[model samples]
Target: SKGEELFTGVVPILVELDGDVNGHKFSVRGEGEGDATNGKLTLKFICTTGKLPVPWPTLVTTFVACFSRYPDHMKQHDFFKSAMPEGYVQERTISFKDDGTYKTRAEVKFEGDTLVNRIELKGIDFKEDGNILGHKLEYNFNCHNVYITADKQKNGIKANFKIRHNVEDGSVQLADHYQQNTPIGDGPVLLPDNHYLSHCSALSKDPNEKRDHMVLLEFVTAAGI
Candidate 1:
């Protein structure tokens, strides 16, 4: 993990993408940073256009569920890159600050930039004082399960860096999101103690179109550094 720079002081994020947004076929690639201690998040990426879904504004509350489509197998590696060149991609970045309160809701969903529904945590583990919950998330050992919400609405997570009403620009206006550095579905493969780690993967949507669309996300907790 030499090239992989997991910040020991903050949460690191990685994303690989090859998909469509606003009915336009797009290919995007970038990295992100989440700072709970300071209530900030920075997402920088390059895509076919600047209207990618990273910073949506339609809904009052939101989440970056793009990771929901990340390939299950790709999460084992340290860093991820697209298989082919990102033809004609442009660069854009959006930053955010946690604006509201600590969120307890497990998961939130979205369609484009609007909130569609909220998802709940399953098999709640009743462990006290784990990390975020005081117990490790059964699905993702690398995460502390701290997806906090922001804004006036219940789904809000962070403030939209800047409101893009016209020319189109974008995480503030950001909301709580879920992340599991490990490939979901296959159960976690934790390494030995005293050994730090990070995992990354490219976007791989669920075959069931109704289940997931094209999007990817990678997370690295402070402890993983």
Candidate 2:
């Protein structure tokens, strides 16, 4: 659908901590759901200092519960492109030429509690490749600059240089960083991970109950249309 066009094809969330916990410092890597939409998500600790703190096990469990709704939050706000009120600015810039090379950017300001998020996307062209199994779509020019700012200071992640979509399967993939460069800069920011402000949902659903109901596989999957 047209609504799917805005996403950068990647939703890897990074929750970096300020200091060490029990002689260990770690970051949370959120593994997004399939179709780049809402579903069960996972957040795991990637420690760089030492073993995880004893309290972390319990803390992370609670954190994951809240983080699960992040996709809904972003969708509700249309990635901050809409639903903005007074004292907020959602500025967008697009540069498309006769050639397929183009640039797309979204900047969200005055809405963050402690940090602001801005994304810049660039694509030289798009191409499609197909096989018996499935079809793949690739985008050229991947200098995606997604950054964050706090107290007038700025830092963020340096993402890979390409975005790809699997048309038949409906999945998006973003390229990894180049030369091990970090886009999430090292700054003294708040602990809650501000990215969630743009993603985590306010609503909740009973997981067990939601899972209990299901559609028949045989009826849902027909051989052909």
Candidate 3:
């Protein structure tokens, strides 16, 4: 495999969620079998949020049964004389409000490379009483689990964040309201907690699985050899 490009197979994907206080170490490992041409990923994330230290107790898992085929867009840009090319940036959030309502948002930015690729947090780790739940993820939520095969080379970037409900699965969707902030390397940099949306349902395709119970915060960053 010299300069000749080839379609590499899917590799293994593992995730470990550890709580800072509870010392609950939860591990989720799954094999992603797919070719550079087409394939699917069946990964899962185990939650480890407990007041006491626990081993592996499958309380709940994020059954990631999704299909993706972006072999063409999986290549890294050539190192320009200036700097790195701007990559894709996005934000998907769901929140709840005081009136028991919900809201949703998905912001995308492909304006320029200089305006892309940084880490920021908002709505993440929100406290209802004294526990953490419904953390409005504000980082590379989806970017952490992806693979791209473009050009003659093949590479991927593992992007992921975390969420642990100190209580129960709190309300999902945008909070009551939201505000804006400057760009942080093209990703979600800030959030005005005052504008929290509430009571929003999750998206569904089969019509049966549709419900107001999903808060997805997504993002993507390009990389390759």
Candidate 4:
């Protein structure tokens, strides 16, 4: 459990280029457009950190500031205001509850090298049609949540994402799980099929999969070694 601290370094940021990776420690970065679909939006993550701890909060903050990006779902909750600290450079703590809940706390023993930014968006789902926005996970398992319930069906699967933003560099990592929803032959997108969300191709101005923009991440610890 002592080495488990390495996984805690996960972080999130606003960028469509470059990712983070380390031995056993995986990382990447994803940014949002003004909404989930329009206006210079880029929604892909690239990881580059390998086996070493990397700060994520700083990277995420920088992405938000530099890209002028924010999730459309943030308007529904106080996470943005609560997650972000007041002006200054210091280490912060974030907790991802297994029950799809998250708590932002202040950490005194800031692990500069290990700190990272992790993200979890609530509104992400599959679009069954113009009227149906599937909020399921694992059903089709398109995103990174495939590790869990690999043998499950192909439909809407519920999932809760947990991400981080490292402080050292601007790197990020995302992790989540599948949830309530039966397999139904690879259903539609795992997100709601709204106009804004529908238009969002994950990236707005930029295309998907570019080598110039990528990050790397790996696991940390003796075993990770």
Candidate 5:
């Protein structure tokens, strides 16, 4: 259990370009605790600068849609399916208890890296969709737990977000799932170019993926980072 390279946190960012000439700047911060097998994790968008960017609501929606469902079902969603490379591996697990609580877990490997995320849902009525395992975890749109904020920064715009699900104790909260931020820039764009987006064609081809990148860029630009 010790020194197993647990996935305490990971922040993976995607950037797309109109052409090879223009430039933009984007960054992300990811933090969490527990082993890759299972644990609580958090991901935050630090900052960016560019043209008209995407909105947060759109970005978060696509994220939940892809991660909350089974890999097989994900192929049905154009953006989700396109994001993955050939022969990718995805795993998901959901366990319901008689106490009216449930646990959802998923592991996905992308671009030769494996990432895992989990959450515990409580205090909600249960419903069923075609997939029993994803009914509660995938269909639920409880965005109340997702928070977003912004402010003017010394150098640029500043913003962050968090997503969490935990069971409360008598007078405290347990180690539930919990999960953003912003920096300075030049001109209207934060950076001259986004290297990652240049290579990941899948990240730019889909509407959802484009929106995801735009939202992150806007957040970063506001922070000036």
Candidate 6:
């Protein structure tokens, strides 16, 4: 199992973009605008509150970790303590177990030249939504890497294009008067184009597809080849 380290890396960030991929029948929600009913979902993430798990002061190229849940169900893992002669109950985590939202579970692929910033998957149906999980894997973020679940020629997807302020460039900038429900474009405009995240919609804003919550993620690895 422990073959090479080139296949290993550290994920310092975790992002979650929620919205209707196509037909917000809204598997997780049906009562509010949290679902992607209009095709545009404010892609937000839950991590060090916009900070990386630090010590990584150098700039590196980040990639979208393409994680796919193999089992697609709640499972368990680990072997610690003997309270009832049972192992540590680990919920079905595809790869990231120690740190990540329960809704996401998958592994990192530290491959060679194959690394990419964005990809197009069939982000439809609960079963086909491959674990597009993890974080930016590095310091510089230029263009918002818009990931579309539906495979097509020109389906506009969310791009993490970036700003390297080590900054919350990928973060939305709104005054102290905007609510969470405010449309991202109107209230919170993506931080003045930098390296954290770039809303590169043909160099402008774009649209989204899929009705399912097309959650895309890629983590920051520690040391990789």
In lDDT terms, which candidate is top? 1
Candidate 6: list runs displaced more than 4 Å: 1-64, 68-151, 154-160, 167-225
Candidate 3's residue-wise lDDT over 1-225, tens digit each?
210122244434332222322222322222223222343333323232323222111111121111123234332221110111222222223233331211222122222311111222223333444222323322112112222111122121122222222223443222222222122243221111111111111211223423212122211222343
Ranking by lDDT: 1, 2, 4, 3, 5, 6
| TM of each candidate vs. truth | 0.24, 0.24, 0.28, 0.22, 0.21, 0.16
lDDT of 4 by residue, 1-225 (tens): 221222223233243223222113344455332221111323344454442122232233223211112244432221112222221122222232222221221121112432223332222122232111211121111112111121135322222334432212332323332223222223222222211111111212235554323222211110000
Regions more than 4 Å wrong, model 2: 1-10, 20-36, 61-225
lDDT of each: 0.27, 0.25, 0.24, 0.25, 0.22, 0.20
Q: Mark the 10 consecutive residues where model 6 has the least summed lDDT.
A: 74-83
Model 2 alpha-carbon miss at residue 134, Å: 51
What does candidate 1's lDDT look like per residue over 174-212, in tens digits?
323332221122222222122122222233333553421
Give per-residue CA lDDT, model 2, range 84-124, as digits (tens). Answer: 21112222222211213223233322232212223333333
Clashing pairs in 2: 70-199, 70-200, 142-161, 156-183, 156-184, 156-185, 157-183, 157-184, 158-183
Q: Per-residue CA lDDT of candidate 5, range 1-225, in tens?
A: 111222223424221212111122232222222122222122332223333222222123222212221122222222212223221122212122321222222222233343322222122222222122122222111222222222233221121222222222222111122221111112221211111100000111225443222221111100011
User: How much is the lDDT of residue 175 in candidate 2?
Assistant: 31
For 1-225, candidate 6 gives per-residue lDDT tens digits of 121111223212232222232232111211111111111212322222233222121111221212111111211110011111111111121111222211222122222322212211112232122221223222333333322121123211122222222223344311111001111122211111111111221111114623322222222111111
Q: TM-score winner among the candidates?
A: 3
Candidate 4: worst-modelled 10 consecutive residues by lDDT: 216-225
